[PDB]
Enzyme design. Structure first.
Site, short mmCIF file in Angstrom:
data_model
loop_
_atom_site.label_atom_id
_atom_site.label_comp_id
_atom_site.label_asym_id
_atom_site.label_seq_id
_atom_site.Cartn_x
_atom_site.Cartn_y
_atom_site.Cartn_z
N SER A 109 -0.71 15.72 -11.87
CA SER A 109 -0.93 15.35 -13.26
C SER A 109 -1.16 16.63 -14.09
O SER A 109 -1.73 17.61 -13.56
CB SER A 109 -2.12 14.39 -13.37
OG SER A 109 -2.53 14.17 -14.68
N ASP A 117 0.84 -1.20 0.00
CA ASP A 117 0.00 0.00 0.00
C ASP A 117 0.87 1.24 0.00
O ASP A 117 1.36 1.66 1.07
CB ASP A 117 -0.88 -0.03 1.24
CG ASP A 117 -1.83 1.15 1.26
OD1 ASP A 117 -1.94 1.87 0.26
OD2 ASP A 117 -2.45 1.35 2.34
#
Length: 330
Positions: free
Chosen positions: A199, A35
């Site tokens: 992004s 994770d």
């Protein structure tokens, strides 16, 4: 040193991936969920409330010649999905894919929430976010990666998740055979303890690319892609009959649909998520309504590049003094 381990989807939907991890001496092999959005290595154990264990493999520290109680230390964690676990702490030898750390904090669960109990395939979590998020008190502990880092050939790990297939986690090297083209690196902020990046925009299907900054985290422990409501609405508007359902808890679409791809930007590079990666199948067995793999982040407080996005790429988690993320097509 290096390590290399295969990671396997737990089910036919790629809901999560498990990776075998050796703990203790002689080795006890547990299948852990790696994770990158958390920083605790915790396991089902011989200490876990018996009614909360249903098929998991447990770690038994009393059977490990290298286990030592970390006296006084406790831990307690709550995840973004509402699940939780808590317990006490051992140090022990932990190996992943041939890479060994001695003295790793192994957080032994005394209690786990119902979602963990009900998932027999996941024996615990191995956190790969920054050690600033580790929940051990009163002495915060380091992640497996942070403990391994100085021994590694390069201070990196890579995630290469499969679509309906096994993939690989590598530590300490970048397998240049595992991706196509070049790797595009992008800056990371560690201010919230995550692999947080920005992004450069998105496209839906064959549509034009929209240049826009989307801050989010790279999180292998989250199944879906969670993005701002504007972006998600633009995606699902391209699927006839898709709608947001408050009863189901997100966007659903007709199982008869063909889904468009979704592209996200990494600097001037582009990662394309095929439409089939966004199909999470019937909402209930036999339903003709299907659950979408792209969902709004509006109720979370952060955008999450979960497995739907990451499985479309070869992802480099660069833990050098200035951390960065890298993405390549594959």
């Amino acid at each position: 040193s290096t390590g290399s381990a295969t990671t396997t989807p737990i089910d036919s939907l790629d809901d999560a991936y498990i990776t075998p991890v050796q703990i203790g001496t002689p080795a006890q092999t547990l299948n852990l969920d790696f994770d990158t959005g958390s920083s605790d290595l915790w396991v089902f154990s011989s200490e876990t409330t018996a009614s909360e264990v249903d098929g998991q493999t447990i770690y038994t520290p009393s059977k490990s010649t290298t286990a030592k109680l970390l006296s006084g230390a406790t831990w307690s964690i709550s995840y973004g999905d509402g699940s939780s676990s808590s317990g006490d702490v051992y140090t022990d030898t932990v190996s992943v894919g041939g890479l060994t750390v001695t003295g790793q904090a192994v957080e032994s669960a005394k209690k786990v929430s119902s979602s963990f109990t009900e998932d027999s395939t996941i024996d615990g979590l191995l956190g790969l976010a920054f050690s600033t998020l580790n929940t051990v008190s009163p002495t915060q502990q380091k992640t497996f990666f942070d403990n391994a880092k100085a021994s590694l050939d390069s201070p990196v790990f890579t995630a290469d998740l499969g679509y309906h297939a096994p993939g690989t986690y590598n530590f300490g090297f970048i397998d240049t055979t595992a991706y196509t083209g070049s790797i595009t690196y992008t800056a990371v902020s560690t201010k919230q303890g995550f692999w947080e990046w920005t992004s450069t925009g998105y496209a839906v299907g064959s549509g034009t690319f929209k240049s826009t900054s989307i801050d989010g985290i790279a999180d292998t422990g989250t199944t879906l892609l969670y993005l701002p409501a504007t972006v998600v609405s633009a995606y699902w508007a391209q699927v006839s009959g898709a709608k947001s359902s408050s009863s189901v808890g997100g966007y659903v679409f007709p199982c008869s649909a063909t889904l468009p791809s979704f592209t996200f930007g990494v600097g001037s590079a582009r990662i394309v998520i095929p439409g089939d990666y966004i199909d999470f199948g019937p909402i209930s067995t036999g339903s003709s309504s299907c659950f979408g793999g792209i969902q709004s982040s509006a109720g979370i407080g952060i955008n999450i590049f979960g497995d739907v996005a990451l499985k479309a790429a070869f992802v480099v988690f660069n833990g050098a003094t200035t951390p960065t993320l890298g993405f390549a097509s594959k």
